[PDB]
Design a protein around this ligand. Structure first.
Ligand SMILES: [Cl-]
Length: 116
């Protein structure tokens, strides 16, 4: 069975950093683009970042460019999101996802709270 498990969330002050990890299981990880999404309870789901099969291509929401960096380890089957220069607006549940090559797969999410 496919499973995605996010970790690395927490409570930090504006300007601080976190690193999210997404431990993937139960599929051929390196055959897929992998993604981070987020949702703040008041708001709609938003794509945060994506990374190509082997990592040469990346995509970022304009609002996270220069702050967040997506990367992956195709042997450890782990996706990462380095989050620097955190802002209040970044407070959200963060979810990793595989969106196929037609099934979608989602983790249960990790809470990031940016607050003084
Ligand atoms: Cl928290």
């Amino acid at each position: 069975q496919v499973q995605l498990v996010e970790s690395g969330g927490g409570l930090v002050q504006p300007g601080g950093s976190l690193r999210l990890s997404c431990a993937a299981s139960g599929f051929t990880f390196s055959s897929y683009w992998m993604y981070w999404y987020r949702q703040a309870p008041g708001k709609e789901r938003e794509l945060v970042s994506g990374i190509s099969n082997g990592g040469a291509g990346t995509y970022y929401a304009d609002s996270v460019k220069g702050r967040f960096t997506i990367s992956r380890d195709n042997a450890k089957n782990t996706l990462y999101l380095q989050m620097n220069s955190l802002k209040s607006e970044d407070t959200a549940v963060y979810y990793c996802a595989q969106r196929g090559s037609r099934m979608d797969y989602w983790g249960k999410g990790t809470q990031v709270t940016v607050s003084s």
